[PDB]
Design an enzyme around this catalytic site. Structure first.
Site, mmCIF file in Angstrom:
data_model
loop_
_atom_site.group_PDB
_atom_site.id
_atom_site.type_symbol
_atom_site.label_atom_id
_atom_site.label_comp_id
_atom_site.label_asym_id
_atom_site.label_seq_id
_atom_site.Cartn_x
_atom_site.Cartn_y
_atom_site.Cartn_z
ATOM 1 N N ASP A 155 1.568 0.161 -13.817
ATOM 2 C CA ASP A 155 0.261 0.260 -13.345
ATOM 3 C C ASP A 155 -0.080 1.340 -12.492
ATOM 4 O OD1 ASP A 155 -2.556 -0.383 -13.836
ATOM 5 O OD2 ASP A 155 -2.330 -1.675 -11.962
ATOM 6 N N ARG A 159 -5.472 3.709 -7.279
ATOM 7 C CA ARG A 159 -5.853 2.404 -6.416
ATOM 8 C C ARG A 159 -4.647 1.469 -6.072
ATOM 9 N NH1 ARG A 159 -5.110 -0.281 -11.708
ATOM 10 N NH2 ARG A 159 -6.067 1.350 -12.776
ATOM 11 N N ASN A 160 -3.517 1.869 -6.658
ATOM 12 C CA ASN A 160 -2.299 1.380 -6.290
ATOM 13 C C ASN A 160 -1.155 1.928 -5.544
ATOM 14 O OD1 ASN A 160 -2.302 -1.315 -7.605
ATOM 15 N ND2 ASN A 160 -2.250 -0.453 -9.302
ATOM 16 N N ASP A 173 1.010 -2.872 -5.458
ATOM 17 C CA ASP A 173 0.302 -3.452 -6.779
ATOM 18 C C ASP A 173 -0.179 -4.914 -6.361
ATOM 19 O OD1 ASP A 173 2.093 -4.664 -9.666
ATOM 20 O OD2 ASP A 173 0.085 -4.073 -9.162
#
Ligand SMILES: O=C(Nc1ccc(Oc2ccccc2)cc1)c1cccnc1NCc1ccncc1
Length: 289
Positions: A155, A159-160, A173
């Site tokens: 992912d 945003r991570n 995460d």
């Protein structure tokens, strides 16, 4: 995962030495809360993940893996965990005060200049090319670190990534270890997850950084067609704050054949040179003006 051990003697932390705070996130499993830990390191702020059978082993595997992987400046540092009976399972890490990179950059759209020249004051706490290239370099280093351990993030996205003190970025995460705009063609169609998929995602993160927090694929409906075109060769156009070499790096990451994509080691060396070249130029810009 369940095979990896757990040295409780080294990581276990007392639940009554944590003062839970405000929610930093939410999922289908539970949440990530900010909190004060006394004597984990004095009182330090930290981020706690806490909680189904399937989810519990997932949280334990995340804990298990962070201990196995070790410490790297560009990956959220584990400080401890609450696993013994008496309360819920909690995983504790360093708290990144400034938040996710995407949200940070969106906020600095009016505070950007390619480089600084005297009176450097007009640019107090401004973002520059040096910053953007540095965040990329760091995320690449953290990914080289994770890939070296056979770890697939799955992912990777703005945003991570979290912004720490003194422009230090850390891979994190919020979930429990569809986001189509960050998924590689083979992951969308073959449901496969590899280090090469993560390289593709790194390219999208790259676009996000040099667009200053914009969302990928501007003005496009994420549907069947979107996917069919990704598989047929269609790619995003260069973002507003990119340099030519950086956009071409994005394109190398978006190569159709996974095997033809650069490795994270190559990305580290490449990004590293660009940062070096940028530094060189800024010196001259600063000197001539
Ligand atoms: O990020 C966290 N955990 C994590 C880190 C790295 C990983 O990397 C990783 C390692 C091996 C394979 C695949 C991915 C996987 C999972 C995590 C754990 C506990 C509490 N909060 C967070 N994050 C939110 C957060 C962190 C700091 N400030 C504000 C919010």
């Amino acid at each position: 995962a369940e095979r990896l051990p757990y040295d409780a003697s080294k990581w276990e932390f007392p639940r009554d030495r944590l003062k839970l705070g405000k929610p930093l996130g939410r999922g289908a499993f539970g949440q990530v809360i900010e909190a004060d830990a006394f004597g984990i390191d004095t009182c330090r702020t930290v981020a706690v993940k806490m909680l189904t059978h399937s989810e519990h082993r997932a949280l334990m595997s995340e804990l298990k893996i962070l201990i196995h992987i070790g410490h790297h400046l560009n990956v959220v540092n584990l400080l401890g965990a609450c696993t013994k009976p008496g309360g819920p399972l909690m995983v504790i890490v360093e708290f990144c005060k400034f938040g996710n990179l995407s949200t940070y950059l969106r906020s600095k759209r009016n505070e950007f200049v390619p480089y600084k020249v005297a009176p450097e004051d007009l640019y107090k706490d401004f973002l520059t090319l040096e910053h953007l290239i540095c965040y990329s370099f760091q995320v690449a280093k953290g990914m080289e670190f994770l890939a070296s351990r056979k770890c697939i993030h799955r992912d990777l996205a703005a945003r991570n990534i979290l912004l720490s003190e003194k422009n230090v970025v850390k891979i994190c995460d919020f979930g429990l270890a569809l986001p189509l705009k960050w998924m590689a063609p083979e992951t969308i169609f073959d449901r496969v997850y590899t280090i090469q998929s993560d390289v593709w995602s790194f390219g999208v993160l790259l676009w996000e950084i040099f667009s200053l927090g914009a969302s990928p694929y501007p003005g496009v409906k994420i549907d069947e067609e979107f996917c069919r075109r990704l598989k047929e060769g269609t790619r995003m156009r260069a973002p507003d704050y990119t340099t030519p070499e950086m956009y071409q790096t994005m394109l190398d990451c978006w190569h159709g054949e996974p095997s033809q994509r650069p490795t994270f080691s190559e990305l580290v060396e490449h990004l590293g040179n660009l940062l070096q070249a940028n530094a060189q130029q800024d010196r001259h810009h600063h000197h001539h003006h």
